[PDB]
Design a protein around this ligand. Sequence first.
Ligand SMILES: [Mg+2]
Ligand SMILES: [Mg+2]
Ligand SMILES: [Mg+2]
Ligand SMILES: [Mg+2]
Ligand SMILES: [Mg+2]
Ligand SMILES: [Mg+2]
Ligand SMILES: [Mg+2]
Ligand SMILES: [Mg+2]
Ligand SMILES: [Mg+2]
Ligand SMILES: [Mg+2]
Ligand SMILES: [Mg+2]
Ligand SMILES: [Mg+2]
Ligand SMILES: [Mg+2]
Ligand SMILES: [Mg+2]
Ligand SMILES: [Mg+2]
Ligand SMILES: [Mg+2]
Ligand SMILES: [Mg+2]
Ligand SMILES: [Mg+2]
Ligand SMILES: [Mg+2]
Ligand SMILES: [Mg+2]
Ligand SMILES: [Mg+2]
Ligand SMILES: [Mg+2]
Ligand SMILES: [Mg+2]
Ligand SMILES: [Mg+2]
Ligand SMILES: [Mg+2]
Ligand SMILES: [Mg+2]
Ligand SMILES: [Mg+2]
Ligand SMILES: [Mg+2]
Ligand SMILES: [Mg+2]
Ligand SMILES: [Mg+2]
Ligand SMILES: [Mg+2]
Ligand SMILES: [Mg+2]
Lengths: 116, 328, 81, 208, 132
Amino acid sequence: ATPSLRGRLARLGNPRRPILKPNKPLILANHVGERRREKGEATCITEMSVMMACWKQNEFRDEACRKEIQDFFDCASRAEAARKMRSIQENLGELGSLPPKKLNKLLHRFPNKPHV
Amino acid sequence: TVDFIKKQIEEFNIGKRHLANMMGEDPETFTQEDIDRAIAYLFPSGLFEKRARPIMKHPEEIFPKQRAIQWGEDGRPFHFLFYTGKQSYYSLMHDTYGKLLDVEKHHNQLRAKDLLAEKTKILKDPIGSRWLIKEELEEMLVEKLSDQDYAQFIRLLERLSALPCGATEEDFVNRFRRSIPIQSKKQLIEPLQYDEQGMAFSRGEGKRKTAKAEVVVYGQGSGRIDVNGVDYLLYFPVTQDREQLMFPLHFLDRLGKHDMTCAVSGGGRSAQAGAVRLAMARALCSFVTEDEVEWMRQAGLLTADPRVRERKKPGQEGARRKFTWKKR
Amino acid sequence: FLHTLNNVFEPHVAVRDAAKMNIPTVGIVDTNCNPALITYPVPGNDDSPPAVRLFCRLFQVAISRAKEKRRQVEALYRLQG
Amino acid sequence: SRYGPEYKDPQIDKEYYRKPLAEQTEEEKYERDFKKTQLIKAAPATKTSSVFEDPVISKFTNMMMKGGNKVLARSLMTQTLEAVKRKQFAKYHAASAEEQATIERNPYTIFHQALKNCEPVIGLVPILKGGHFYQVPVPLADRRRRFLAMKWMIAECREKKHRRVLMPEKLSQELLEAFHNQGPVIKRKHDMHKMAEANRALAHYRWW
Amino acid sequence: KNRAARVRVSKGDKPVTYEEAHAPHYIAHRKGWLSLHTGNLDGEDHAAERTVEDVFLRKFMLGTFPGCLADQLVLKRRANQLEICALVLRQLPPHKFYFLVGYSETLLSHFYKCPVHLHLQTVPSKVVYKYI
RNA sequence: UGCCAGCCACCGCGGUCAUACGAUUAACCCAAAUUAAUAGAUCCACGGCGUAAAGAGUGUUUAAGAAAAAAAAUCACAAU
RNA sequence: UUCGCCAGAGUACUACUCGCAACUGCCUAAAACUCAAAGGACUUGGCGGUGCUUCACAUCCACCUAGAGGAGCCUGUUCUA
RNA sequence: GAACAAUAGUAAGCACAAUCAUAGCACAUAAAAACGUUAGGUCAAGGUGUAGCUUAUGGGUUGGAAAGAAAUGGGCUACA
Ligand SMILES: [Mg+2]
Ligand SMILES: [Mg+2]
Ligand SMILES: [Mg+2]
Ligand SMILES: [Mg+2]
Ligand SMILES: [Mg+2]
Ligand SMILES: [Mg+2]
Ligand SMILES: [Mg+2]
Ligand SMILES: [Mg+2]
Ligand SMILES: [Mg+2]
Ligand SMILES: [Mg+2]
Ligand SMILES: [Mg+2]
Ligand SMILES: [Mg+2]
Ligand SMILES: [Mg+2]
Ligand SMILES: [Mg+2]
Ligand SMILES: [Mg+2]
Ligand SMILES: [Mg+2]
Ligand SMILES: [Mg+2]
Ligand SMILES: [Mg+2]
Ligand SMILES: [Mg+2]
Ligand SMILES: [Mg+2]
Ligand SMILES: [Mg+2]
Ligand SMILES: [Mg+2]
Ligand SMILES: [Mg+2]
Ligand SMILES: [Mg+2]
Ligand SMILES: [Mg+2]
Ligand SMILES: [Mg+2]
Ligand SMILES: [Mg+2]
Ligand SMILES: [Mg+2]
Ligand SMILES: [Mg+2]
Ligand SMILES: [Mg+2]
Ligand SMILES: [Mg+2]
Ligand SMILES: [Mg+2]
């Protein structure tokens, strides 16, 4: 259910005092907005820290710990593959919804009437 | 502009008669092919652009197609779609859609009579069939079109062909077919050659970067290579070049079995090695099986190397390198 | 006009421009149409198939009938002299 | 780019073309290769069908080359491989049966192993934040790492030798010292690793 | 912007000859050479002489037939004789045209010490390739 | 002549091609008058008050006015 | 139906008055003088150390290679002459 | 002054594009690139408007044009 609009805006007829002051008029627009691209954060940081502990302990000889090196590598590979392959599928599939282009077209087929 | 076309055809025929007379040929057996040679010889214009050179041709080919008159003398437009502004295109769309509906009806009656008697003619792919381009369609309706227009129409033809195809339907969609010409990249095998009681020698010619190379290979010989009358170890002191010469033979495992003579000119040492490489490769294609030819091509043995020195450009230094740019 | 609207639900341009051009206009105006600029409006349903098929058939027959009557009366006028 | 994007890179491998009949998906694949009427770039002069050429040795050769001299750089590489070889043949005959079982005489395997040991795990990128440039730990691609190894080798055995000393000498030295992990190159690798631990907190500034 | 030998686009009314509608980069591609002579070929001599001669001929002809010159001159030189060929507007009575033909041919023949031919082609109005 | 000298009711003019200054030629307009200066005559709102000048921070009454036809005072919630 | 207000802009939520538990106060509220505008809304640009998307292919960052900036010369500027 | 499951735009022309060149394609490169912007550059290429000189601001002859306190640009050769 949509929040009530009755009595809310400041109008010549309205008895009471405003509840909303809308910054820009509340009229459904004929297009939607474009999806905000996800803010990235560092990847692999945990495996990095584990490897760094392994080094600090074993005095930075690489032969000593081959597991944490190899696993940090494995992880960086999974973050590269992630960056490449996730871009396209996140840019197409919205799951249950439609890509904003299709939504815009659909909304131009049945637009809002402010006028008349 | 109709009187024009009539006149132009009159004078093209009178003229073709005249021309045939001076060139001293039979006016009946005179072709366009002959008209061309005749002008080319009479009005010899070197100009690089071929469209700017002298032309005498049948006015139908010279002049562009004309939209015919669209209405009678009373003002009533002949075609019922006239007011659309594109009659040609929307008629096409109309009849196409009509044939689609027709197909749907007929095939539904045949669904109720327990008959699917048709087949899918939609695979012409071995014929190398494609749709018309927008340009072609635009020429067939004598009318300008839009990209979305062309798109619409094509999509509709697709809808059509995706159903059971009638005879008149197949014939209909096939005006809009073209066939893409021959696609095969298979090479042309040099016929093997037998010379002066000597058996089995083949020839090939490489070109790389200012170096030309002609290589004759004998199948009947042992392994050695004579380049410009000397041994290949002497002519190509650098290992890298000897390896280049080795590449195609080692690839075909012919390394001991053939005996070659070469003439290479121009370029430096590496360019000559490259040239002989290519030529040798092209010569050994006579001796080998048709499959290994495809292999050599897929190893990049048979393609000339297009990379060549670029021209220095005025106001720069090196054909790319720029004179030092001072900001302030 | 068999439908006075365009697929974006505003009035079809041709209405304003036929008016603009002094051309008289017949049209089937559904319940949500604006009849004002239409010379002879006929209120009724434009959306359902038997309706549109009906109106098509009617205007068809009227036209054909008229063109006939004109042919026949022309023939009569030709035999008059 | 005297080749249109239409042109595929050639596959030089002989083994691939010689023994096709046992693989379905690859038969289908190179079927689609040639039958696509696909254009092929002409095989480069550097690369050969030779059973003897190591792409890593060739890369290194190239990174050593100054000006246009392949002849000179291929010389120096050849001489260096020969020098490692003879240095290990020297170390072999002055040794005892145990160490004669242990010591490696293949200069190729020595080259490779010495590079694998010298390649960095982690790296540093400068990142500007709040008007300051922090050095931040960054995971590296494989190629970047191999590159860093080779470039560090060559930079050291160009820079730090005494002018009397020739290149294949110093290079064979450093190859063998990096084989056993005690080389200055390896110390550089460690300086990087330590600078990367010192800054590990800053690993948060990396947004990718 | 290159300006050389160009006729700039006006409001779209401007009549333009086939010659004037083609910028220098089209020479030998679309339009051809307004002169022909041996001098500029590889192993040949006295290019300079023929150039000056040319310049004087264009100037001279332009002044001798005021207002009636349609397009720039065509100068063909063959085995010591020069055939000048011109496009001329019909302005003068054929009396004046023949007077000037004869006058010119003789005058220039005695000036340049070689036989000079003059060929007039007559045109109603400047032939128009473009705009207009 | 050259942002000088000067001009103008208002807008503005004069920086080297000034119909705007100064003089000449031509013209225009008034005319025994013609310009300038100053006073008048005339001229503001029966118009307006969200954003331009203007609804007075709030309510009650006084004085003064309007009543011009039909009815009403009153129930969840954070008055004081 | 009423009432309260408003007669260019500045000067000016100011100067003088009256009143006020206010004493650097509130209220009320001019003129000389200066200007030929001052204002209101919009329009198209341009711009924005504004936000959101998309990019840069020798190109900004990340990165690669060779140089310049230091030396001697060569040649051009600026000065000084 | 657009929306193509189309809502007011058609438009010739010039640019872009295409073609031409680099001796076969292709690619690359070359060439091309309108209208305008910077009162950008050039009265010393030549030509010219306006304004200036005319026994000179014109035409000739002979000889002189130096130079490095300093600052700097671009190059060459290097430092092996
Ligand atoms: Mg209340
Ligand atoms: Mg607001
Ligand atoms: Mg260079
Ligand atoms: Mg309806
Ligand atoms: Mg005056
Ligand atoms: Mg004056
Ligand atoms: Mg005046
Ligand atoms: Mg005056
Ligand atoms: Mg009087
Ligand atoms: Mg106000
Ligand atoms: Mg209020
Ligand atoms: Mg107040
Ligand atoms: Mg007023
Ligand atoms: Mg005032
Ligand atoms: Mg206050
Ligand atoms: Mg006060
Ligand atoms: Mg007072
Ligand atoms: Mg750069
Ligand atoms: Mg240098
Ligand atoms: Mg330097
Ligand atoms: Mg320097
Ligand atoms: Mg100077
Ligand atoms: Mg147009
Ligand atoms: Mg070409
Ligand atoms: Mg191209
Ligand atoms: Mg260019
Ligand atoms: Mg172009
Ligand atoms: Mg200037
Ligand atoms: Mg200047
Ligand atoms: Mg001058
Ligand atoms: Mg200097
Ligand atoms: Mg320079």
